Amino acid sequence: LPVPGPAETYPNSTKQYQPIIVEYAEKPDKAFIEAKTRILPYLVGYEQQTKTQDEYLQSVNKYGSYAKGQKFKATGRFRVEKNSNGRSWIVDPEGYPYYVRGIASFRMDGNSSAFGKLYSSVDDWVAKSQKQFSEIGFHSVCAFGKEEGDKAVNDYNKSASSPLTQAPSFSFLAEFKNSKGISYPGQNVNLKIGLVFYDGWDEWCKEYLNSDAFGMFRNNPDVLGFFSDNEIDFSTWGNRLLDRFLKISNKQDPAYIAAAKFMTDKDKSANVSDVTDELNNEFAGICAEKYYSAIKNAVKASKDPELLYLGSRLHSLPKYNSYIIKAAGKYCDVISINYYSKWSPEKGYMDGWKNQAGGTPFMVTEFYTKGEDTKLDNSSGAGFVVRDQQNRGFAYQHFTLGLLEAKNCVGWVFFKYLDDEDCNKGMLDYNYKPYTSLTKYMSDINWNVYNLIDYFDK
């Protein structure tokens, strides 16, 4: 480990740490900067409690929930709770607190020759992976499995005694568009959220929840919950949502109609000149309200009202819009947030999320860094570049410690299972080989989340 500097108070915390420096670049061809970083060995007043894989596995149940402390009422299904000190938890079917530690994109999308040498079947792949992941303190796979990955895990969990819990991702807005035989508003996919104003949105959601798309997931205790979309544009850099809706050419478009109505309702002119960031943000919130409420109401009306709705994986500017967070807190069981472009979780914003959402928790559905040591292209994706796998480990510790302090965060998902052929996004390389330097540092956090929480909350 690098030698650290003098103890100092971590920003927005009561706890001290001895900082190290980790270099990072925003893209592989850019200059690296030096970032003060908090790692687990250098937390003042904490010493790593769970030190081996066996110690860890003896402390948790088959879901990865802490088995030796507090538990809550069991309902036979994953659900959301809050403890007396204002911390939210996902609770497992037996009532035990499950701190979410997931892996995204669990699918067989590496080198096929490597796959064949390492795994003898799809079942073997799931089984070996469930064990591999549990040893590192990951227990769930979340999003982007596609049909084959989702079915593989679903089939495995039906017969296995030790599940790999799953959280499938869907594309509700696209599916609605396809069901109705229409185009995106303004012929622009980036305006797809405007589909919530089209005739039949609420009803279509009800039907979709009751359809075969949910057949393997409904009433299935090994399903953590579902995501309805990913990174919906609710305003982007350089383009506000409300401005773009008002500029839709076809003024018969329900999205235009709704935007113009909103303006008129606020005693304003239905023109781009009257639009402010506040108005834009509020309008985006109305869109979010119509989106999330339709989906939550669809779950409640469905054949499985106990399936958790984990949101739409907010990102970019939308995750900072208090109006969208307010909407998501009213309807989502857990608000999902993809968390990019920051070295440190922003505790002021996370505290804002707590208030805005009415106490409904959030989860981080994607975060990572890439290692320059791989020598891969490394240009695709928003994760920062660090020098090597050890520093990916340090970045994982820094980011996750930041999240552990947020009492409204119920956990996270590392993006992702495998590298791309040309980018170090994975916990495993493209030949299905774990980056052991990374997984060591991941394990040290993941095994200790419950006692770290105790340390932060005491």
411 DSSP β-pair partners: 100
Closest CA to 437 of 400, 399, 388: 388
DSSP-derived 3-state class of residue 161: coil
Greatest distance between any 2 Cα atoms in the chain: 67
Instruction: Please give the torsion angle defined by the CA atoms of residues 291, 297, 298 and 301, in that order, rounded to the nearest 10 degrees.
Output: -170
Please state, in angstroms and as integers, the Cα–Cα distance from residue 356 to each residue in 81, 165, 319, 335, 341, following that order. Answer: 18, 29, 11, 11, 22
DSSP state of 280: H
**Obtained via which technique?**
X-ray
Please give the helix or strand (H or E) that residue 36 lies within, else none: strand 33-37
Q: Determine the 3-state secondary structure of 207 from DSSP.
A: helix
Phi, psi of 314 (to 5 degrees): -70, 155
The number of distinct structural domains making up the chain is 1
Phi, psi dihedral angles at 82 (to 5 degrees) = -140, 130
| Distance of alpha carbon 156 from alpha carbon 434, whole angstroms | 22
69: Cβ contacts below 8 Å, ≥ 6 apart: 97, 450
Question: For 428, phi and psi rounded to 5 degrees?
Answer: -120, 150
Residue that the structure tokens 């069981």 belong to? 333
Residues 246 and 256: beta-carbon distance below 8 Å: yes
Domain coverage including residue 338: 1-458
CA angle 405, 406, 409 (to 5 degrees): 125
Pairing of strands 33-37, 20-25: antiparallel
CA Rg, the chain, in Å?
22
- For 24, residues 6+ apart whose C-beta sits below 8 A from its C-beta are 32, 33, 35, 343, 369, 384, 385, 386, 391, 395
SS3 378: coil
